Amino acid sequence: MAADILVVDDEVDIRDLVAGILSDEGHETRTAFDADSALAAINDRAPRLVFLDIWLDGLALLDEIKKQHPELPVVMISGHGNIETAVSAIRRGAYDFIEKPFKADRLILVAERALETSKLKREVSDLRKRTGDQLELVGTSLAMNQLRQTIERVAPTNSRIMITGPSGAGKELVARAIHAQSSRANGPFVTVNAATITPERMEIELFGTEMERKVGALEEAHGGILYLDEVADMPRETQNKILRVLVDQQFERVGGTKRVKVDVRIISSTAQNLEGMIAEGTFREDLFHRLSVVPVQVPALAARREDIPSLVEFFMKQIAEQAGIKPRKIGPDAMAVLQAHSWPGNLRQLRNNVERLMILTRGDDPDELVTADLLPAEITESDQHIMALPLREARERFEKEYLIAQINRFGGNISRTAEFVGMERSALHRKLKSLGV
Amino acid sequence: MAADILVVDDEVDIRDLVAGILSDEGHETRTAFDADSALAAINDRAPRLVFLDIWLQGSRLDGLALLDEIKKQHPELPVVMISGHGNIETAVSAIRRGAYDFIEKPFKADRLILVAERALETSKLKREVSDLRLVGTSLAMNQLRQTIERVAPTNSRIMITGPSGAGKELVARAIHAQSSRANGPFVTVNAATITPERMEIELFGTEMDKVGALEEAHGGILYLDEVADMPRETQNKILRVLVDQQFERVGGTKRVKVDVRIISSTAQNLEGMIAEGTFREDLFHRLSVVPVQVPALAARREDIPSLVEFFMKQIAEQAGIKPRKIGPDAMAVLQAHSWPGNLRQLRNNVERLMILTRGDDPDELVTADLLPAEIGDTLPRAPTESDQHIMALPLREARERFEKEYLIAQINRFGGNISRTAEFVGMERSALHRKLKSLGV
Ligand SMILES: Nc1ncnc2c1ncn2[C@@H]1O[C@H](COP(=O)(O)OP(=O)(O)O)[C@@H](O)[C@H]1O
Ligand SMILES: Nc1ncnc2c1ncn2[C@@H]1O[C@H](COP(=O)(O)OP(=O)(O)O)[C@@H](O)[C@H]1O
Ligand SMILES: [Mg+2]
Ligand SMILES: [Mg+2]
């Protein structure tokens, strides 16, 4: 909207003209005539945008501004004569360029777009800190290093990827890392979660509808990557259509005849045994062979236990950022129990456990260690729970469980249990029977 | 970038040149010479970008009318207009109507290349923020939402009070989003996380031999998460920001002017701190021009079922776990709990339930036994040989203690509504009242 802009030019009429139009728009404008006055203005306060004259030199100052302030957009002011240098400045780090003489509306528009893009990148950084959704693969283990090198090798190719690994191991993160290291890194990254899509709406989610517009995952993925997250959750009807899209890169939109042609790089994943599903007749053999082109195996947390301390530390920093809870020191006993667990939910389960620990100790002293007793049990019927029952039934269940527990406490000695609970021997017998013990 | 670009211009010379330059850059370019050919091309496949002439002669709809039709069908599809020299008023009109930018005839190939790249980059960044990104029907939530709506368009300093995980930061972002600084930065300072020795450096930066949060927040909002953790020297410096709209960097005399709207929060008793001499009296009153209280989750138990459903849908989107049916037992337990970690704690427990039931029968209800000890052990449940207090008591005393604990827990669950509690526990309401009075609970 209305930001702090620094106008760097050697001519006063340009400094006054640019600063004038922008200030009149609602911005705060400061000026500088050379590199030293520019660097000093940035030292007074970091601006949200810079307008830099190519011939002051401009390109050297452009490198310096971008070195110290990578997130600060710089728009070049260029002479009518040469666009070659203005284009050279874009490659060196400049956002855009403006040509003399310019219309005021052009100057206003360029400033707004440079600020909008800068705001979008800042909103991206801010939202990644809240989602705890960064694109970095933490792990010093050999399983992690081999995975990182597999990513580095398969990403620059155009090959179809098949990702195998258990739930929460990092299959989606690997797919995003493959995308960020591919030729389609600037192209879209579209995800299809079969598990979280109703069967009655799968066709519409993948192919869209004929004519505000409902655009399917395949059309949205055109020129980029389509991530089929957990293919094993696709019904027979869905498996058929996917196979059919793989043969010709074409499909119809639901309700329509129009055959849309797409150009998509497919990355698939499974935490399931697909070859076994083929034997059970639940998964198509032709689909499997077409999706299983280049394999990428993401290791289980059980295959990289030595990474758990580094991951706990990494997750504690994310939650410190999200919640404002200071990171804690995990006790050697609690860490030993964590490192020994089988982790069916892998890293997603580890993060969830780290977050619960941080919530529970939020009030505690900083020097206090997180102890093994704080760890949950894994590390009756719904109709029978006391909280879900009315008073009489809830009272009856409590009475039954109390007596059962008191009997076990006295190791089956009914007469001593009776005496302690405040009952006569035969009355306890009749009560136990009436309660169905 | 290898994008699908639709080029719409009535001039064949123009279409060929735009399609030619962009196709030579590595893009896939398509052309149309009127509205109907353009809409037929969009129907073939939605492009990633549209170049659109403002005029469009010999067409069913002109350039601005087609711009409107493209944006209606595809709101996130960037449209760059093609305009003639001296047509800037009509081009600026297209920007206000939904166009991303415009290119003025005649243009350099490198200019067209740069406009395409910038439009696509902005489109992609919007796609990221949409992918990554206040629930409750309670009067409490409705009052909070109408408080945000009222004070967000003002320029007044806010003091947000409430327990940890209740939604203070989310309230601050909601105020930011509805304020005149919504396009400005939203900078947070986690005071509980920063060491007292590094607090000044984080807020005010250092002289060069570095950029503080206040300098980053210029033009926007600075969110001071937990003001109680600020040292006395930091307190005096914030006071100068509030009164003088300026400060000095760490180890300097150099003035730094700032235009910030401060939002402060605390889960602590600041009044208790002023009484003890650890927090400045004048600073507290200046920080609390407009007080906003976020209610504890235990004070809005009505919203727990809605929050459970909202959090399930959110984890479904993140993890790819199908949302499940929470058993009446698990819901009764979740609703009755005190929640010292509030909405964060609730969310973390819903995620826990979805992680642990991943791969189980979709019909199978999520039961209360899956919840951890801090949830289950604070509420009525079947006793065991390990429950020292119950075991030390005889039958009548143990049954009376259970009655008291069960009724209180059910009351909590129903937010103190005795008529609703009576209905569930199997009593008439006056009978429940007489039973509570008799029990003295
Ligand atoms: N190597 C890693 N380093 C850091 N965080 C990771 C790593 N692998 C996964 N995560 C995180 O763990 C969680 C689960 O990972 P995810 O990619 O969704 O796995 P999957 O697709 O196998 O279920 C996510 O929050 C993700 O960011
Ligand atoms: N009413 C609400 N509806 C949905 N989610 C909420 C609501 N209030 C808070 N949250 C969520 O609860 C969690 C804790 O909120 P947060 O703002 O971080 O609390 P605080 O700042 O008080 O510690 C976050 O995940 C947040 O998005
Ligand atoms: Mg000049
Ligand atoms: Mg024309």
List the 24-43 stretch of A: residues with Cβ below 8 A of B: 28, 43
Helix axes A308-323, A346-361, angle to 10 degrees: 50
User: Does A302-374 carry CATH code 1.10.8.60?
Assistant: yes
B133 chain-A contacts, CB cut-off 8 A:
127
A95 chain-B contacts, CB cut-off 8 A:
118
CA of B144 relative to ligand 2 center, distance in Å: 13
Contact A314, A345 (CB under 8 A): no
CA distance B339 to B18: 61
CATH code, residues A386-435: 1.10.10.60
CA distance B63 to B14: 15
Contact B250, B205 (CB under 8 A): yes
Burial class (CB in 10 A: 0-12, 13-18, 19+), B238: buried
Residue (of B206, B244, B245, B249) closest to B222 by Cα position = B245
CA distance B259 to B245: 6
Q: Identify the helix (H) or strand (E) that includes residue A5.
A: strand A4-8
Q: Which residues line ligand 2 (CB under 6 A)?
A: A 323; B 134-136, 162, 164-170, 310, 343-344, 347
> In terms of CA atoms, which chain A residue is nearest residue B181?
A1
CA distance B129 to A122: 10
CA distance A141 to A303: 9
CA distance A268 to A160: 8
Q: Find all residues with CB under 8 Å of A36, minimum gap 6, and list them.
A: none
Q: Find all residues with CB under 8 Å of A385, minimum gap 6, and list them.
A: B327, B328, B329, B332, B333, B367, B368, B381
Q: Pull the structure tokens for residue A84.
A: 């070659």
CATH code, residues B4-132: 3.40.50.2300
Residue (of B396, B144, B357) closest to A399 by Cα position = B396
Residue where the block lists tokens 């304020």: B179
Residue where the block lists tokens 């964590």: A338
- Residue A309: how many CB atoms within 10 A of its CB? 14
Q: Identify the helix (H) or strand (E) that includes residue B169.
A: helix B168-177
A168 chain-B contacts, CB cut-off 8 A:
319, 355
A124 and B124 within 8 Å at the Cβ level: the answer is no
Residue (of A141, A145, A174, A168) closest to A296 by Cα position = A174
Site from A48, A225, A387, A424 to mutate, B interface, most B CB atoms within 10 angstroms: A387
Contact B247, B241 (CB under 8 A): yes
* CATH architecture of residue range(s) A142-301: 3-Layer(aba) Sandwich (3.40)
Residue (of A303, A302, A371) closest to A341 by Cα position = A302
CA distance A359 to A354: 9
Site from A129, A259, A359 to mutate, B interface, most B CB atoms within 10 angstroms: A359
CA distance B84 to B103: 9
CA distance A407 to A416: 9
CA distance B213 to B222: 7
* A432: contact with B, CB 8 A cutoff: no
CA distance B345 to A325: 13
Q: Please count the CA atoms within 13 angstroms of the CA of B11 that sit on its side-chain side.
A: 13
Residue (of A397, A428, A395, A427) closest to A412 by Cα position = A428
A74: three-class secondary structure by DSSP = strand
- Tell the residue nearest (CA) to atom 13 of ligand 1: A348
* Amino acid in the structure at residue A281: G
Q: Pull the structure tokens for residue B400.
A: 């009376």
Q: Pull the structure tokens for residue B288.
A: 């609390």
Q: What own/partner pairs with CB < 8 Å and gap ≥ 24 does B397-405 have?
A: B398/A398, B398/A402, B399/A395, B399/A398, B399/A399, B399/A402, B400/B439, B402/A395, B402/A398, B402/A402, B403/A391, B403/A395, B403/B439, B404/B439, B404/B441, B405/B379, B405/B380
Ligand minimally distant from the alpha carbon of residue A17: 3
A87 chain-B contacts, CB cut-off 8 A:
110, 114
For residue A289, give how far its alpha carbon lies from the nearest alpha carbon of chain B (Å): 24
Distances (CA, A) of B174 to B132, B155, B158, B178, B221: 17, 15, 12, 6, 12
* A212: contact with B, CB 8 A cutoff: yes
Contact B32, B6 (CB under 8 A): yes
> In terms of CA atoms, which chain B residue is nearest residue A411?
B385
Q: Pull the structure tokens for residue A382.
A: 């719904």
Contact B232, A366 (CB under 8 A): no
A386 and B380 within 8 Å at the Cβ level: the answer is yes
Helix axes A58-68, A84-91, angle to 10 degrees: 20
- State how beta strands A49-53 and B28-32 pair: unpaired
CATH code, residues B139-297: 3.40.50.300
> In terms of CA atoms, which chain B residue is nearest residue A356?
B348
For residue A5, give how far its alpha carbon lies from the nearest alpha carbon of chain B (Å): 11
> In terms of CA atoms, which chain A residue is nearest residue B313?
A196
CATH code, residues B388-439: 1.10.10.60
Q: Where are the extended beta strands (E) located within B213-299?
A: 221-225, 246-248, 255-257, 261-266, 290-293
Contact B266, B111 (CB under 8 A): no
Structural class in CATH, domain B298-377: mainly alpha
* A243: contact with B, CB 8 A cutoff: no
* A289: contact with B, CB 8 A cutoff: no
B425 and A390 within 8 Å at the Cβ level: the answer is yes
Which of B188, B344, B351 for a ligand 2 pocket mutation test, highest count of atoms within 8 Å of Cβ?
B344
If phi > 0 it is left, if psi is from -120 to 50 it is alpha, else beta; for residue B205 that is: left
Q: Find all residues with CB under 8 Å of B216, minimum gap 6, and list them.
A: A46, B185, B187
- State how beta strands A369-370 and A161-164 pair: unpaired
Strand partners, A190: A226
* B407: contact with A, CB 8 A cutoff: yes
Identical topology for domains B298-377 and B388-439:
no
B385 chain-A contacts, CB cut-off 8 A:
405-406, 408-409
Q: Pull the structure tokens for residue B354.
A: 């979805």
Cα dihedral angle (A376, A381, A384, A388), rounded to 10 degrees? 60
Structural determination approach: X-ray
Residues in chain B: 441
* B203: contact with A, CB 8 A cutoff: no
> Which of B215, B320, B395 lies at the smallest CB-CB distance from A230?
B320
CA of B346 relative to ligand 2 center, distance in Å: 10
Which of B170, B265, B301 for a ligand 2 pocket mutation test, highest count of atoms within 8 Å of Cβ?
B170
Distances (CA, A) of B245 to A313, B256, B262, B286, B423: 38, 9, 11, 13, 59
DSSP B53-76: ES--TTSSS-HHHHHHHHHHH-TT
CA distance A60 to A43: 18
A109 chain-B contacts, CB cut-off 8 A:
92, 95, 101
Handedness of CA A80, A84, A87, A89 (dihedral sign): negative
- Over the range A41-59, which residues count as b (16 or more CB within 10 Å of their CB) and which as e? bbeebbbbbbbbbbebebb
* CATH architecture of residue range(s) A4-131: 3-Layer(aba) Sandwich (3.40)
Entry resolution in angstroms?
A: 2.4
B52: three-class secondary structure by DSSP = strand
* Amino acid in the structure at residue B118: R
Residue (of B285, B162, B44) closest to A258 by Cα position = B44
Domain positions in chain B: 4-132, 139-297, 298-377, 388-439
CA distance B230 to B267: 14
- State how beta strands B49-53 and B4-8 pair: parallel
Contact A228, A268 (CB under 8 A): yes
